[PDB]
Nucleic acid binder design. Sequence first.
RNA 1: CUAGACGUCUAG
RNA 2: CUAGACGUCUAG
Lengths: 122, 122, 122, 122
Amino acid sequence: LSAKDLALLLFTHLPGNNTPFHILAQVLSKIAYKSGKSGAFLDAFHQILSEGENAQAALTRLSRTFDAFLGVVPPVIRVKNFQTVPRPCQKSLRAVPPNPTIDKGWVCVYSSEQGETRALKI
Amino acid sequence: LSAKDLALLLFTHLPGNNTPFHILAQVLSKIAYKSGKSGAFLDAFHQILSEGENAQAALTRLSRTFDAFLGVVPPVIRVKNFQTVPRPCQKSLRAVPPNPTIDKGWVCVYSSEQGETRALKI
Amino acid sequence: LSAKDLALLLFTHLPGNNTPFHILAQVLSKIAYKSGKSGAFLDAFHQILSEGENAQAALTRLSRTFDAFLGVVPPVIRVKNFQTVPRPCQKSLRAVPPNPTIDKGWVCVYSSEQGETRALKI
Amino acid sequence: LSAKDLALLLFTHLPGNNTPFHILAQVLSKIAYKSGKSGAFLDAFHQILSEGENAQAALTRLSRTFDAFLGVVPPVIRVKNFQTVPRPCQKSLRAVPPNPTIDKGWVCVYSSEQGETRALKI
RNA sequence: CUAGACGUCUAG
RNA sequence: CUAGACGUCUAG
């Protein structure tokens, strides 16, 4: 199952659109796919849901416990400006810390044309 | 007190029409009735109200604490499509998780004519 | 300042006519006057406005914090039927809870000729 | 770019005539110009539009976030009477609060020939 | 203390 | 479309 199809599937479990969790779904999906852990990642995700957790709690937990995400630095996404970042994510932008990693809640790093950077934090 | 009468009574405490809480009222009433807990349920509902809680917070609380609802899987409701579902509920629809239970906020499972399913989440 | 004059003054700060907030202005003015807290009530109301809050936010806040309103049960108002209640208030009518008090958002209790009761809720 | 030209430019983005937002455009422009922020103001206005916001949402937002408007008291406008105020604005008139500021939605203060005052609220 | 997703109403 | 009041769920 491709990263795209994987991300879309996780989307069906999330409320709203273009939320920090949506971005996290895309990021975790891609990292999982490229690691060949696409199937295992999906299984773990559903396992958590069965425990009584919701999609959001599952993604945050997986980002902290799924070995494939441990120590992995958030991906850098280029954007005209920070106002280009999905609206529901804007208020979650922080200055980038020295060593950003996904297991620490850092979803991605936005880079503006002006060279400025902001990290999406959950 | 029948399920219908019980639901209609809860409706008088709820704002608007056909809200997720309206659906929850019906589900909870129906389950309570066939459990023989129709009376206890209503009493508990009034007790919570007397504590200062509103109707909405009372229903969600009951769904989480009332023993007759614990572990109970949400009922399946047939609909032509997901646009047939009451307006006020549509944006609260999500993919059905592995083990949906009412005590976890899952009101009901809608099934469409093409075998698709969406779960009402509060 | 009389309850009437007091209510009329608050009216000038409220948008529209015969809204739930208009009814609240009357109820709070009446209770305040009878308590001899007419002056204090008006002062607190303006103190809040100066904070940047609007009239509506001020009234709901006072109803929750102004000691003179704490634990006070909403006044019962007689009306032919619930259709007699001001239009703008009709959709805010709920069944009366066990222990209605103003500090809980309950403005007043409407009693119809048929003995039915509805509570105005903000 | 003078205050007049600036206001006329904002007008081209606004629906109808003599609406509360038209008055806001004039006030905000006049204040911006005198602050030497005429240019910055226009740029910010266009920036917001490019984000998907309409002219109306842009003005209200600027009035809340543009530093040149923070803490500024609405200007006083003389009128024969409150029926002389643009029709589209009349129903938005309210009693002047203790400390009216533009960043709180207060556009302007109208004063009549009888020494009476009303504030335009958005 | 942040933030996200809903629901109800009111005024223009 | 804009402004406001009330409430429900959730994540850090």
